[PDB]
Amino acid sequence: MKVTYSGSDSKTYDGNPANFEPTTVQWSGLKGLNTSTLTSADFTWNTADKKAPTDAGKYTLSLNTTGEAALRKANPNYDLKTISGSYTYTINPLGID
Structure with a gap:
């Protein structure tokens, strides 16, 4: 009962820069939730400039207010009152032999 x-x-x-792929985001909590309309624009990188990073490091992204609105629009039978989550994207250093 919680998305x-x-x-x-x-x-x-x-x-x-890293390319975030929204199809790697895994959704749970509501059978039949429609997530098919979400795009990369619906998530924000939690970086200093809120842009996709290039340097090696561990980063996160969060569903943004645009994304909340998109998810709500895709699910008219519901009033989605909370949306909670975590998403981690890592850029690993390049091995130089």
Whole structure:
């Protein structure tokens, strides 16, 4: 009876910004919840500039207010009063032999 999200992903450092993939986010708590309309724009990187990072490190993203509205719109039979979650994205350092 409580909508939650979780998930994780990673890449190896390549000097390019990370590409968050919303299909790696795992949803739970409500049978039949429609998450098919969510996009990368619906989550915000919890970084200093709120942009996708490049440097090796451990980062998180959170569903933002745009994302809350999108999820609510996709589920008209419900009044989704809480949405809680955690999502971790790691950029691993590049091995140099």
